[PDB]
Amino acid sequence: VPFVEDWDLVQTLGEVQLAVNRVTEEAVAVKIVNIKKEICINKMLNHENVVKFYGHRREGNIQYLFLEYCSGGELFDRIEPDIGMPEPDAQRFFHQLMAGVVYLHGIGITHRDIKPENLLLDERDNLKISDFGLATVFRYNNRERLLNKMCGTLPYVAPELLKRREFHAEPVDVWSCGIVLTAMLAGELPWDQPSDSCQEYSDWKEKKTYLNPWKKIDSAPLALLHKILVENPSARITIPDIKKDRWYNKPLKK
Numbered sequence: 001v002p003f004v005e006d007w008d009l010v011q012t013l014g015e016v017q018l019a020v021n022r023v024t025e026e027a028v029a030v031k032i033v034n035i036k037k038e039i040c041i042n043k044m045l046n047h048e049n050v051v052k053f054y055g056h057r058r059e060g061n062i063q064y065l066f067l068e069y070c071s072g073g074e075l076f077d078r079i080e081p082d083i084g085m086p087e088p089d090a091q092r093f094f095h096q097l098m099a100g101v102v103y104l105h106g107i108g109i110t111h112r113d114i115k116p117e118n119l120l121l122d123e124r125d126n127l128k129i130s131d132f133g134l135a136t137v138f139r140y141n142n143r144e145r146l147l148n149k150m151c152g153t154l155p156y157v158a159p160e161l162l163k164r165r166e167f168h169a170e171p172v173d174v175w176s177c178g179i180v181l182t183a184m185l186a187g188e189l190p191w192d193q194p195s196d197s198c199q200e201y202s203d204w205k206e207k208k209t210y211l212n213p214w215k216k217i218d219s220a221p222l223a224l225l226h227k228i229l230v231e232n233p234s235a236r237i238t239i240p241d242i243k244k245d246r247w248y249n250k251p252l253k254k
């Protein structure tokens with residue numbers, strides 16, 4: 001079939017471009033640019049809540065990564081500042097985010113930069129984890145390796161990343177998911193970074209939930225956040241236990 005390999009770049013998405021097939025009109029996201037690792041990690045991924053990797057091509061110096069186009073855009077743009085979004089929508093997005101993270105952790109991959117800007121929505125508002133540029137392998141041949149590199153985005157990073165030389169990968173992604181849930185339910189981030197010098201972080205450790213953002217959050221999701229945003233990563237709730245949480249399993253409908 002002639003021209004089936006030709007793609008028209010119609011507009012910028014983030015460099016990320018929306019590309020449309022000349023023959024079929026299929027839409028795909030093209031990333032134009034560590035790259036070897038990023039491509040290799042993407043080649044391992046196959047899950048409904050993880051952005052699909054179609055393939056890659058290298059034309060001289062520029063690297064073109066062909067990825068799934070998510071027409072709903074970023075989860076970031078569904079969060080109304082200072083408000084958040086309806087609690088049933090946040091729960092559904094959080095369920096899909098847990099499915100994606102369970103999948104990644106199950107094949108030994110940590111994302112290391114979970115935030116609403118990297119969580120995309122397809123045409124049916126299904127959540128897709130995206131951007132594996134900071135991702136890495138934390139389990140290989142069933143042996144866990146402890147991480148030490150400073151990766152992520154400060155308002156979403158776990159406190160152990162700033163306090164400890166080495167740390168387990170999985171509780172770090174759990175923590176960032178808890179900050180994402182806080183943002184979805186309150187439309188604001190609780191602190192600039194999780195440090196004792198940060199007054200908002202100290203207030204949370206002192207259980208001052210009469211303050212913002214916590215006062216905007218219902219007691220059932222707030223009880224889950226109390227279990228996720230736990231400073232000690234060895235005491236922090238694990239994903240199997242998040243799936244048994246009361247709010248996680250509460251039937252919700254707008």
Ligand SMILES: COc1cc2cc3c(-c4ccc(-c5ccc(O)cc5)cc4)[nH][nH]c-3c2cc1OCCN1CCCCC1
Pocket residue numbers: 013014016029031038042051067068069070071072073074120130131132133
């Ligand atoms: C800001 O809006 C968007 C940003 C997007 C980034 C996107 C991506 C995407 C971005 C990055 C990756 C990726 C990057 C690196 C990597 O290792 C693995 C994956 C994969 C996919 N797919 N669809 C996307 C967007 C759609 C977007 O919105 C839909 C477009 N719509 C009409 C134009 C104006 C904005 C709303």
